[PDB]
Nucleic acid binder design. Structure first.
Ligand SMILES: Nc1ncnc2c1ncn2[C@@H]1O[C@H](COP(=O)(O)OP(=O)(O)O)[C@@H](O)[C@H]1O
Ligand SMILES: Nc1ncnc2c1ncn2[C@@H]1O[C@H](COP(=O)(O)OP(=O)(O)O)[C@@H](O)[C@H]1O
Ligand SMILES: [Mg+2]
Ligand SMILES: [Mg+2]
Ligand SMILES: [Zn+2]
Ligand SMILES: [Zn+2]
Lengths: 212, 629, 590
DNA sequence: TTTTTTTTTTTTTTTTTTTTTTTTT
DNA sequence: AAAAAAAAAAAAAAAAAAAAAAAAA
């Protein structure tokens, strides 16, 4: 989004990975790819694509001890979460745990932590939600009804299955803003995720049980 | 010798036919599983070689199949296992020759329609197919999944019967390598191009296409479910219905696809599919399916006597109830209800009565606040029984829960596909968050709960799909909390007609009890750091389904009548769930279910009393009052 | 010219059987059957496979295991059997129809091993395509040498001669109809959709199957092709079609009478003279339903129905009575609907929201084999001259309720879709089951308020039956006793004076009667209608209008039809008036 | 070389389902 | 404020009319 022209929309390009360049990138992964811009023959108009040669996962998708052993190291990470956001010392310490998450036990109880920041307008709720997105390894930030319905869950698109923010955020942190003003069906879908950690769909063209 | 479409080095390999043949014969003649458990292998004289007894069974029954466990070969000889897995095409014919030689050396006078063909199974499980590689092409693999759909029979030619247009001379050409060599010149009168192929006089085998959903135990982050295509050939057609959970062992086939269904040009990219070699319906983490119950030879006499002895213990019911979901604490009544649901009532035939089908399953609605361990029970039962399904309210629709129509993107034909409810025909449908369900999709459940059928009438086809499902629904109180100020029926927030369908509405409330809180905290903490085994409960349920067919008795009938009258009097209040005639039927089922637990084969006073007690304990009728609340 | 010795021997033995087999009387029965083969529109001889087994067991076995490769030879044997006896046209062809095959196979059992050999199956007809002329063997002209390649046999595909040896007027055609069937409910395996294989019918038996009928097809499974690719599809070729459960062992009253056997007519006539046949029919048709005598009587009169009539101006007088059932849950409404469906032939049952408009009324598709279009019959159509049981009527969408109202109004469905228009007939009575609004019937309101049916829908319902669940202890005890007796003794405990088959035959016979209305009955009707209108002068559950006079006339007609009477006596009018009066319920209020 | 049947592509419309929105208690 | 019914979106399927290319003789 930082490099799209002011009045334009992001442009998409095709990449044909092969050999040992497969199963390296999943949907939603920020990737720098070095390949060859080659056309596929169809005047002699020709489509294009990138023949992948080197795939690297960047930023959050990217893939000393003395300070970690410190007593206050717990506070330091907390104080380092969105430092420009003054105060909220306790909240950041709670979000820190959300990033770390509990530990799954299978005697199957989930090990995730769900934190809802409810408050009055202009108390930097969104900024923290936006900050977590730029920090968590796998994350998705959906706001209100802009990305609703199939935006969260999956859809059928041969017919393949495409996951929504939850699926892309699977084993990650899905930052939901304005949860209260979310579509009632979407809230129901989340209810399953925060307890079942799955998305059971039985629509017309879809009958699966996703893993979120 | 029925040809199988599924199927010095020969060429570019590491196998010589004689070596594999002799090694397989040896393995078949001198293999004993040391850790074999008598129950694990029923009706087999363990001390003697296993597969020779298998051959004896084949001689007796006549089934010309030998289910060979690939793990047995792996243990006995790893090199032969490598050869088999790497080159299933060449190895399996060698095994067929070996087993035929062994079984005609002994029993030289046995009669079979064709020769005996081996079926390797339980090959090293491929956790996730996506992890498969082009290096794994044309190799035996075993996967586990659920069958979404099965297509109708497709006849595939094996021998072409040609006749001369002039002299009518008949010859049978045989498929060579996927092609038939048209003679192009008659052998009788020598006329050119006078041989025409005749379809109906030719020889055909079967081929069934099965679209199967895999349940890969290795689920990388963000990976969507995966569906694959299987081909079943000449005996495995319609061996698995939609909804069945299977372990499929077969050859990983990749075939060319033509850019159009008419031009000979093919995409550089292939698309892969499995040729089924063996189906395994057994799973140690679930109960026995209906097919396993159907076949009689599943319970060794010792195991049958063990189950009989278990049934004679007074605490059989409570021991069985305590077995379900050991990680859930002191839900004795709920677990008893789920046990009665698993056992199910008698399946009766009412065609002669002119009454129609009668529902013999049991539907349990757990109404409770979100905090209570509701969804855990539903997920456990969904992860316990076969032919089970799960739904989460707003995530489903009526058409998707009943049936729909779609263009199969491998034959490009508009075909009808079943829904979630049908897939669990003879299983259990766990409907979670039942309250958060629009009335449109809810309306469907009425027929599935009373009639057990689903009569669709749409442009595509008009027909009624039979669905004998048992519904395990979970609902939250209106306002997400069971406020004691509102009456029971008001708090449930469901139409009275629908609540009448359910035969057990368990109210999961939170009694502010210190002892219960302390014990539950102890239990949960113990779980965080951590009986009657599955192998015995599973067998008990399978046997009870197979043999026990309880029939009502005089005293049971009288007690049921009196109990129904008492229920009608009790539920006649304003806020309590009113009692209808449909509830009497419910009691019957429950009673029968309990009578099925004791293997009584006849419902008597105790069973009806237990059914009435369980129903009254549900709805907390004792803890309620005429001033409902 | 190689001779198929097996086929020739089969032909010889079959001809010997045809010219030698004798019935019980000792006469050559098949000679008598062939006697009718001379007349045009008659080119098929029905031969019972039981006779074939009795005469020559080896021949029957050979035919069963080699049906397809010998059927042409059986046809040739029949042609020789008939030609030498009479002066049939030389070009006329003849076909052999087998029936009474002892064993039946399931649609799931039609494996490739059954290809090209005799088999009988049972199924439900989904739809029948039109009838076409089919080319079996004609003439071909080479455009390179004008050498006429003659009598090339077509195998379900336009098959030109493969190589030159070097028209229509001179060809032989046979009737051909591709009718699609589907698997029966009993045969359906757990959790699987029904299977459909398009069976193909030929001369004579080219329209014996209609959409919605349960039929047994006897014939052969075959493969049809759909460098070259051999893509084959299974298809059934049937040489005979018969009902799966024949109504009569042997359309106007006398024709139906002769259609029956001697014993069936004895039974029908005996019950026609059976005084109190009304109560006997009520009990026998609903043995497991306690009480609710009024609803049973209503559905019985519905099964019989009135007498349709046409006005001089062309107005159509509805002659089929509809019924609706409304009340508290667990009042055995859906049980009444299921009883009517399972009993009455041509009875189709549906649900509230499970049926769309097209599948509930009709649809159109284009024939895959010609330029014409075929009509997929919806639920309403399959109930033609029958009954449609709509359970949970109140839940039905308005887009569909409009269609149901149209069907009740003018009995017809008008379609303008997919390049074709059509006005099709739907002479169906409607048995609806509607839940009261709020899920319980409120006695302090008119019927209009207790249910969510639109006024037009209710207007044309002849009978409304209210089933309130009064919490009476005696009724509860009786209901419990009956239900427990049912569930204790399943097969027995049902002593119905007349078997459902006997009642079906009696209904089919009685439906043909068209009772008159004598002057005495007319005066009695006038007085009864006067009194019934005076009833509305406390309040009733719904007003009484002239439509109630129409309902009373129709109910009297149905009552007359029940006893197979020819004139509506005053007693029938009295009974109809009493039943309709009981159907009206007072709106009690504090 | 010259025909022919197919192949596509390019528009357009139609039908089912789902989702979104509007009205009522 | 929440549920029921209606309307619109949108996606998939069908007709089809016409221009171009590959296979056949
Ligand atoms: N505690 C805080 N410290 C620093 N900035 C804040 C704080 N609270 C609010 N803001 C400022 O308010 C602006 C909008 O905040 P926003 O995240 O939209 O509030 P909310 O989402 O809670 O309504 C941000 O630019 C942020 O810089
Ligand atoms: N009067 C009665 N006699 C016999 N059985 C009855 C009677 N009333 C109710 N029942 C039983 O109650 C059960 C449920 O009735 P049902 O028809 O499903 O209710 P609804 O009319 O609401 O659909 C039926 O199986 C039926 O056997
Ligand atoms: Mg905000
Ligand atoms: Mg009902
Ligand atoms: Zn020849
Ligand atoms: Zn020629």
């Amino acid at each position: 989004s930082d490099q799209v022209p002011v009045g334009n929309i992001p442009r998409s390009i095709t990449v044909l990975v092969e050999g040992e360049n497969t199963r390296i990138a999943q949907p939603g992964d920020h990737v720098s790819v070095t390949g060859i811009f080659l056309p596929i023959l169809r005047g002699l108009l020709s489509e294009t694509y990138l023949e992948a040669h080197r795939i690297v996962k960047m930023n959050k998708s990217e893939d000393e001890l003395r300070q970690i052993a410190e007593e206050d190291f717990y506070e330091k990470l907390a104080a380092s979460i969105a430092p420009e956001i003054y105060g909220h010392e306790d909240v950041k310490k709670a979000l820190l745990l959300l990033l770390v998450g509990g530990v799954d036990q299978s005697p199957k109880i989930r090990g995730n932590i769900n934190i809802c920041l409810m408050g009055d307008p202009g108390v930097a709720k969104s900024q923290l939600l936006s900050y977590i997105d730029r920090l968590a390894p796998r994350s998705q930030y959906t706001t209100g009804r802009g990305s609703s319905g199939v935006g969260l869950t999956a859809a059928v698109l041969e017919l393949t299955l495409e996951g929504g923010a939850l699926v892309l955020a699977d084993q990650g942190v899905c930052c939901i803003d304005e949860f209260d003003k979310m579509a009632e069906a979407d809230r129901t879908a989340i209810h399953e995720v925060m307890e079942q950690q799955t998305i059971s769909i039985a629509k017309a063209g879809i009958l699966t049980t996703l893993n979120a | 010798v029925r040809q199988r479409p599924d199927l010095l080095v020969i060429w570019g390999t590491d196998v010589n036919v004689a070596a594999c043949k002799e090694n397989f014969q040896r393995f078949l003649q001198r293999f004993i599983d040391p850790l074999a458990k008598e129950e694990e292998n029923v009706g087999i004289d363990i001390t003697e070689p296993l597969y020779m007894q298998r051959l004896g069974e084949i001689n007796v029954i006549g089934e010309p199949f030998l289910n060979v466990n690939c793990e047995h070969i792996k243990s006995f000889d790893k090199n032969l296992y490598r050869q088999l897995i790497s080159y299933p095409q060449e190895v399996i014919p060698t095994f067929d020759m070996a087993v035929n030689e062994i079984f005609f050396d002994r029993y030289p006078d046995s009669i079979l329609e064709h020769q005996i063909q081996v079926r390797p199974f339980n090959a090293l499980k491929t956790k996730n197919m996506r992890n498969l590689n082009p290096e794994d092409i044309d190799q035996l693999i075993t996967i586990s999944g659920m069958v979404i759909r099965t297509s109708q029979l497709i006849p595939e030619m094996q021998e072409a019967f040609f006749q001369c247009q002039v002299c009518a001379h008949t010859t049978r050409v045989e498929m060579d390598r996927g092609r038939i060599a048209e003679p192009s010149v008659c052998g009788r009168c020598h006329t050119t191009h006078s041989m025409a192929l005749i379809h109906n006089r030719s020889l055909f085998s079967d081929k069934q296409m099965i679209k199967l959903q895999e349940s890969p135990e290795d689920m990388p982050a963000g990976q969507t479910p995966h569906t694959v295509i299987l081909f079943a050939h000449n005996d495995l057609v319609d061996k698995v219905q939609p909804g069945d959970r299977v372990n499929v062992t077969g050859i990983y086939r990749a075939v060319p696809i033509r850019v159009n269904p008419r031009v000979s040009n093919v995409k550089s990219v292939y698309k892969t599919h499995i040729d089924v070699i063996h189906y395994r319906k057994t799973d140690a983490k679930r109960l026995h399916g209906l097919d396993e119950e159907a076949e009689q030879k599943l319970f060794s006499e010792k195991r049958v006597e063990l189950l009989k002895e278990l049934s004679r213990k007074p605490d059989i019911y409570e021991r069985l109830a305590s077995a379900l979901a050991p990680s859930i604490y002191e839900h004795e009544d709920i677990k008893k209800g789920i046990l009665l649901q698993l056992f199910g009532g008698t399946r009766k035939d009412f065609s002669h009565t002119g009454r129609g089908k009668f529902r013999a399953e049991i539907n349990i609605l757990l109404c409770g606040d979100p905090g209570t361990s509701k969804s855990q029970l539903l997920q456990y039962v969904y992860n316990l029984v076969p032919r089970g399904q799960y739904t989460s309210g707003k995530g489903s629709s009526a058409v998707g829960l009943t049936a729909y129509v779609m263009k199969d993107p491998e034959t490009r034909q508009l075909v009808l596909q079943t829904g979630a409810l049908v897939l669990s025909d003879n299983g259990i449908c766990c409907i979670d968050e039942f309250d958060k369900m629009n009335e449109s999709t809810r309306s469907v459940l009425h027929e599935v709960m009373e009639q057990q059928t689903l009569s669709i009438a749409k442009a595509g086809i008009i027909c009624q799909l039979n669905a004998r499902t048992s519904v395990l629904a979970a609902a939250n109180p209106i306002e997400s909390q069971w406020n004691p100020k509102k009456t029971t029926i008001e708090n449930i927030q469901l139409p009275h007609t629908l609540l009448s369908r359910f035969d057990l509405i368990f109210l999961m409330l939170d009694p502010q009890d210190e002892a219960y809180d302390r014990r539950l905290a102890h239990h949960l903490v113990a779980l965080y750091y951590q009986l009657l085994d599955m192998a015995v409960l599973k067998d008990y349920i399978a046997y009870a389904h197979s043999t026990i067919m309880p029939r009502l008795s005089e005293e049971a009938s009288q007690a049921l009548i009196e109990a129904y009258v008492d229920m009608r009097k009790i539920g006649s209040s304003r806020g309590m769930v009113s009692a209808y005639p449909r509830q009497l039927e419910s009691l019957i089922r429950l009673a029968e279910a309990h009578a099925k637990v004791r293997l009584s084969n006849k419902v008597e006073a105790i069973d009806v009393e237990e059914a009435k007690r369980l129903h009254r304990e549900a709805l907390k009728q004792s803890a309620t009052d005429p001033r409902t609340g | 010219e190689v001779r198929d010795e097996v086929a020739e021997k089969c032909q010889k033995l079959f001809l010997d059987f045809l010219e030698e087999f004798q019935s019980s009387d000792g006469e050559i029965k098949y000679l008598q059957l062939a006697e009718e083969l001379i007349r045009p529109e008659r080119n098929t001889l029905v031969v019972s496979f039981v006779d074939l087994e009795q005469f020559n067991q080896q021949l029957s076995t050979t035919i069963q295991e080699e049906f397809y490769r010998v059927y042409p030879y059986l046809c040739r044997a029949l042609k020789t059997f008939v030609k030498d006896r009479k002066e049939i046209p030389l070009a006329k062809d003849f076909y052999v129809a087998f029936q009474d095959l002892p064993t039946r196979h399931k649609i799931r059992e039609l494996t490739s091993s059954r290809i090209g050999l005799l088999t009988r199956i049972s199924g439900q007809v989904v739809r029948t395509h039109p009838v076409h002329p089919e080319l079996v063997s004609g003439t071909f002209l080479c455009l390179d040498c004008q050498t006429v390649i003659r009598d090339v046999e077509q195998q379900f595909k336009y098959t030109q001669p493969n190589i030159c040896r070097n028209d229509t007027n001179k060809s032989r055609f046979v009737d051909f109809q591709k009718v699609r069937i589907q698997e029966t409910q009993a045969e359906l395996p757990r959790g699987s959709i029904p299977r459909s294989l398009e069976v193909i019918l030929r001369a004579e038996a080219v329209e014996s199957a209609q959409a919605g009928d349960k039929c047994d097809f006897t014939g052969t499974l075959i493969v049809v092709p759909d460098v070259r690719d051999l893509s084959y599809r299974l298809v059934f070729l049937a040489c005979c079609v018969a009902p799966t459960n024949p109504r009569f062992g042997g359309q106007t009253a006398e024709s139906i009478k002769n259609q029956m056997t001697v014993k069936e007519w004895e039974k029908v006539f005996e019950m026609s003279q059976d005084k109190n046949l009304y109560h006997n029919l009520c009990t026998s048709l609903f043995p497991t339903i306690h009480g609710n005598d009024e609803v049973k009587r209503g559905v019985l009169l519905m099964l019989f129905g009135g007498v349709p009539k046409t006005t001089g101006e062309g107005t159509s007088l509805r002659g089929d009575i509809n019924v609706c059932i409304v009340g508290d849950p667990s009042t055995a409404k859906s049980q009444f609907l299921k009883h009517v469906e399972e009993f009455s032939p041509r009875a189709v049952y549906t649900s509230g929201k499970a049926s769309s408009a097209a599948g509930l009324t009709a649809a159109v598709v284009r024939d895959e084999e010609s330029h014409e279009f075929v009509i997929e019959a919806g639920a309403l159509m399959l109930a033609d001259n029958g009954v449609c049981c709509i359970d949970e009527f109140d839940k039905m969408d308005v887009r569909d309720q409009v269609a149901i109202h149209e069907a009740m109004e003018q009995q017809t469905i008008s379609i303008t879709k997919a390049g074709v228009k059509a006005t099709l007939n739907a002479r169906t009575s409607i048995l609806a089951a509607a839940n009261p609004i709020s899920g319980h019937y409120d006695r302090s309101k008119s019927l209009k308020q207790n249910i969510n049916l639109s006024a037009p829908i209710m207007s044309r319902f002849d009978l409304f039956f209210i089933l309130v669940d009064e919490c009476n202890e005696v009724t509860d005890y009786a209901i419990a006793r009956r239900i427990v007796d049912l569930h204790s003794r399943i097969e027995e405990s049902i002593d119905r004076v007349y078997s459902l088959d006997d009642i079906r035959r009696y209904l089919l016979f009685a439906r043909q009667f068209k009772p008159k209305i004598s002057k005495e009955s007319e005066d009695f009707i006038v007085e009864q209608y006067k009194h019934l209108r005076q009833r509305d002068g406390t309040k009733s559950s719904w007003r009484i209008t002239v439509r109630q006079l129409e309902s009373m006339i129709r109910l009297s007609e149905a009552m007359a039809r029940m006893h197979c009477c020819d004139e509506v006596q005053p007693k029938h009018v009295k009974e109809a008036f009493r039943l309709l009066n009981k159907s009206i319920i007072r709106v009690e209020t504090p």
